[model samples]
Target: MHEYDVGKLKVEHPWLRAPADGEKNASFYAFIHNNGDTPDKLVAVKVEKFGSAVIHGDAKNLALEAPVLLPPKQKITLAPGGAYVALLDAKKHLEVGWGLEMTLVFEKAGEVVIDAAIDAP
Candidate 1:
């Protein structure tokens, strides 16, 4: 598990499934909390030195949304079937217990850099 803080947003336990070597698509999830008095939004998530990332919504995880809202004093859990970061076109080998440097671009917080790891277990 990993934790990152930027502005008033606290990212807790950002992790993902260890992708196969040269895997194209993968997902990273975390618990994001807005601790400020005002709401914030996550505009984009990017994996540095890897491919890009996008927001996937809906229960089926098919819809593409630009920004995921972060309500003040509320924590949003990004998991399967929920709002999550989808790493698109990523073709790299990620091992378990590895912390990969990633970034979360937020509307108010600017760039919240995080090291999203593969599974810890």
Candidate 2:
């Protein structure tokens, strides 16, 4: 797990699930806290070692959406079965002991890069 502070946004515990054999996709989870007076949103996500990445409404759903709002003085938790960052068409196998580099693009806070550790399934 890792944390980052980008302007008014505080990101904490950025993590990912270790991909199972033959699994082509993975989910990233984190807690985002907004300390600014105005609202912000997660606009996009990028994985350095993956083919594609997106902010999903939840883990079970894959509707391909973005701009998840981060209201002022509130925290958004992305966990299993909840909102998370999904990595699609993984370029390589993701192991439990490894870390994946990801960049989160926000509407107001700009971009914050993080290294998410792969957790055991």
Candidate 3:
């Protein structure tokens, strides 16, 4: 687990599930807390070792087509089997005990880099 703060935004415990052989995608989970009184938006994500990182909305069913909004003084929890950031077309295999580095871009907070621990299923 790792934590980072950029301006009024605080990111905590960024983690990822280990990808199996032939798996093309991986999802990252974290808790994003807003410490300020202004709302922010999670616009984009980038994984250092993957082709792309997309913010997936995991409400009811998974939707990979949009960004997530972060309300002020609120906490957004990206848990396993729920809302998360998806890494597409990984350049290398994501094995257990490994760390995946990623950058999260927010509308107001700018960019926050974090290391996500790859956990076993």
Candidate 4:
């Protein structure tokens, strides 16, 4: 378990899908909840296993002109219609039932490392 502060934020129910056959790419999903009275924002994300790490949102391959500044006690989720993380150039093929180590960096949160387990449903 790793701990970091992102302006008093809390994350729960984080999960990622195992790479499918011939699929070298994977997307990560998570729920970010601001526990503090004041809102927090997400600055960036990092991962060692992939060549590139990026935060994406509803827009397809879209870029954010500015960082996502959240309101106080706001909740954000990484899902099909919202922000998410994408891992590129995985060192090895991510097989089913495998887990990967990932680190998330936020504007206020220094850095949080969490084990991302692969799951298929």
Q: For every model in order, what is the number of clashing pairs?
A: 0, 0, 0, 3
| lDDT by residue (tens digit), candidate 2, 1-121 | 3689998999998998866677888888889999999999988998778888877853356575755779899999998778887788887777777788889999888998898878866
**How far off is residue 51 in model 2, in Å?**
0.7
How does residue 77 of candidate 1 score in lDDT? 84
lDDT score for residue 19 of model 2: 61
Winning model by lDDT: 2
Rate residue 55 of model 1 by lDDT. Answer: 79
RMSD of 4: 3.2
Writing each residue's lDDT as its tens digit, candidate 4 over 1-121 gives: 3233444786666667655677767777777777777655666667777787667744444455334455666877776556677767777766556667777776666677777666654
What's the lDDT for all of these models?
0.76, 0.82, 0.82, 0.66
Give candidate 4 misplaced runs (Cα > 4 Å): 1-7, 58-68
Residue pairs in steric clash, candidate 4? 5-109, 6-109, 39-72
Compared with the true structure, what per-residue lDDT tens digits does model 3 show for residues 18-108? 6665688877788999989999988899777988887885456667566677888998888877788777888887677778878889999
lDDT of 1: 0.76
Candidate 3 lDDT (Cα, whole model)? Answer: 0.82
Worst 10-residue lDDT window for candidate 3 reads 57-66
Q: Per-residue lDDT of 1-121 in model 1, one digit per residue for the tens? A: 3788899899999887665555667777888899999998888777765677877634353585656788898988888667787777755566675677887888899997787777632
| Native-to-model Cα distance after best TM-score fit, residue 35 in candidate 2, in Å | 1.1
As a TM-score, model 1 comes out at 0.84
What TM-score would each prediction reach against the true structure?
A: 0.84, 0.89, 0.89, 0.76
